[PDB]
């Protein structure tokens, strides 16, 4: 029996417990997002990669949830190549940041997708 | 008259004010645990070796009390060699951690034993 590790075992929500996404796997997630007609958007963060509580600790309040938007949500995008390209533009600009791809469903006004697409060195 | 030292004088509860346990002394504590028919278990911690208060400070609340369990409590163990071996397995895996041996009394649901078995470098 194994002992689940304790150090340097930070996770990133959805898909973060699976092996690293391959180009194909990443591609398939983008396809999934677009096939369901959700709006893709990229978010990046370099200062606070995980949730914390510096300004308040009442129920449901956490800091670190908001990351910063890369450009704007890609309204009307139907080409996964556009998403993947923006991911490359974001990476070259913020190689030091964690970058995630999210997908909005404006009818429900909920993100039906969210996964980490890039992690900076040592992560 | 001596002045009780102030720096680097962190203690570890039971037995921590005595000279370091020798192999024999450590062995005798394990025997004591098993003779009383208590269930042995190992716990390790590398991040917060001492109690602190980061999330709350109401009466009786402290952080740092919970360490992480090595495998599972050794239910039905009657061989001290099994305990000492798990202590060696834990040490090789977590040479950076503080490791303690605890003993449960399920009838009272209280730990009737708890002592530090290994301390990482500089401790």
């Amino acid at each position: 029996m194994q002992v689940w590790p304790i150090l340097n075992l930070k996770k990133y929500e959805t898909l973060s417990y699976l092996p690293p996404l391959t180009t194909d796997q990443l591609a398939r997630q983008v396809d999934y997002l677009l096939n369901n007609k959700w709006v893709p958007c990229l978010e990046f963060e370099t200062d606070h990669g995980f949730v914390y509580r510096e300004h308040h600790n009442s129920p449901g309040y956490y800091d670190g949830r908001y990351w910063t938007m890369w450009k704007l949500p890609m309204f009307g995008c139907t080409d996964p190549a556009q998403v993947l390209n923006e991911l490359e533009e974001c990476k070259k600009e913020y190689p030091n940041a964690f970058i995630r791809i999210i997908g909005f469903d404006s009818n429900r006004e909920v993100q039906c997708i969210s996964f980490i697409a890039y992690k900076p060195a040592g992560y | 008259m001596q002045v009780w030292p102030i720096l680097n004088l962190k203690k570890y509860e039971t037995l921590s004010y005595l000279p370091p346990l020798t192999t024999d002394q450590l062995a005798r504590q394990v025997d004591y645990l098993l003779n009383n028919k208590w269930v042995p278990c190992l716990e390790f911690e590398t991040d917060h070796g001492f109690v602190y208060r980061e999330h709350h400070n109401s009466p009786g609340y402290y952080d740092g009390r919970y360490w992480t369990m090595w495998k599972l409590p050794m239910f039905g163990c009657t061989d001290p060699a099994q305990v000492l071996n798990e202590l060696e397995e834990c040490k090789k895996e977590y040479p950076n951690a503080f490791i303690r041996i605890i003993g449960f009394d399920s009838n009272r649901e209280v730990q009737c034993i708890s002592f530090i078995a290994y301390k990482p470098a500089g401790y």
Binding site: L9, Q29, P59, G60 | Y61, T68, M69
Partner: protein
């Protein structure tokens, strides 16, 4: 939005044994479960306050435990602290201490506690930003038989009105009764804003909700890793899948038990997103994962041929 969780069903786990654990052991079990990948752990429904563990002590140790798992993993964690009590006053004291601890979620047994107290708690939770997980203890005493009683869909609509953020909805494939078509029907009545009459699913009336928020159905009871594909497919992302015995029954402890469930779920989510058929490919999806997850493999080893298939008492 509060939990910053999207794209997959949420994972929970009821601490076992149901009764008998001390407050410190409860927290200990809670920390191990959460650090492994579960989003929540919860008080078993009959754990209120008792000689073996008083509630405040439990709330306190569970807060220490969940905050520890959260800092370790980097994911928001919660533990349903049970506010169910004998009087409204006592119930409120518990909701109040949970608020003081800054934790995100509490729970209540709406039927044994009652609609009057439940509505009082629902308002308090709205007023204090606490998520409310609802357990339906006693419902089968009322809704099991086809000839007499009240169908659960009526008890579910009533709860959505009174107020609750989660509601146990059955597992379909687990240890307790729950037909798929009937379940899919009331799950829609719980989550959606409009549901057209559909007798094949037991829906006798078209029901509109005028934006009343939707309730997250919670599948719990005799489920384990092999059931993951069916659960993901029946409920979809907006559900909470809970594994108590399925986590604390793992041969390697709570943390690996949790990893097993978390890996199984994401494996199913990835497969589904890639176009695979969860119904036809479930076992293969799970099996593939065991190839890279020792934790899932062991769990799979343990529960490979455990099914719960009996004739249902309440059908359409």
């Amino acid at each position: 939005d509060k939990l910053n969780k999207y794209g997959r069903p949420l994972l929970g786990c009821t601490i076992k044994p149901k009764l008998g654990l001390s407050a410190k052991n409860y927290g200990r079990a809670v920390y191990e479960c959460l650090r492994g990948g579960l989003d929540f752990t919860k008080d078993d429904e009959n754990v209120n306050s008792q000689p073996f563990m008083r509630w405040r002590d439990r709330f306190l140790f569970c807060a220490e435990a969940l905050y520890k798992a959260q800092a370790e993993t980097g994911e928001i964690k919660g533990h349903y602290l049970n506010a169910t009590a004998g009087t409204c006053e006592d119930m409120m004291k518990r909701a109040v201490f949970a608020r003081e601890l800054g934790v995100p979620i509490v729970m209540h047994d709406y039927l044994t506690g009652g609609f009057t107290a439940n509505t009082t708690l629902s308002h308090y939770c709205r007023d204090n930003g606490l998520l409310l997980h609802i357990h339906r203890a006693m419902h089968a005493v009322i809704d099991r038989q086809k000839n007499h009683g009240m169908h659960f869909r009526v008890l579910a609509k009533a709860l959505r009105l009174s107020g609750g953020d989660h509601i146990h909805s059955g597992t379909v494939v687990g240890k307790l009764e729950g037909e798929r078509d009937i379940t899919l029907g009331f799950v829609d009545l719980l989550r959606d804003d409009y549901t057209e009459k559909d007798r094949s699913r037991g829906i006798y009336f078209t029901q509109s909700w005028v934006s009343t928020p939707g309730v997250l159905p919670v599948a719990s009871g005799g489920i384990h890793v092999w059931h993951m594909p069916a659960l993901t497919e029946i409920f979809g992302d907006d559900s909470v899948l809970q594994f108590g015995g399925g986590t604390l029954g793992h041969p390697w402890g709570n943390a690996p038990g949790a990893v097993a469930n978390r890996v199984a779920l994401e494996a199913c989510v990835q497969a589904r997103n890639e176009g695979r058929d969860l119904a036809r490919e479930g076992n293969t999806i799970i099996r593939e994962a065991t190839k890279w997850s020792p934790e899932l493999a062991a769990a799979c080893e343990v529960w490979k041929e455990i099914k719960f298939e009996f004739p249902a008492m309440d059908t359409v």
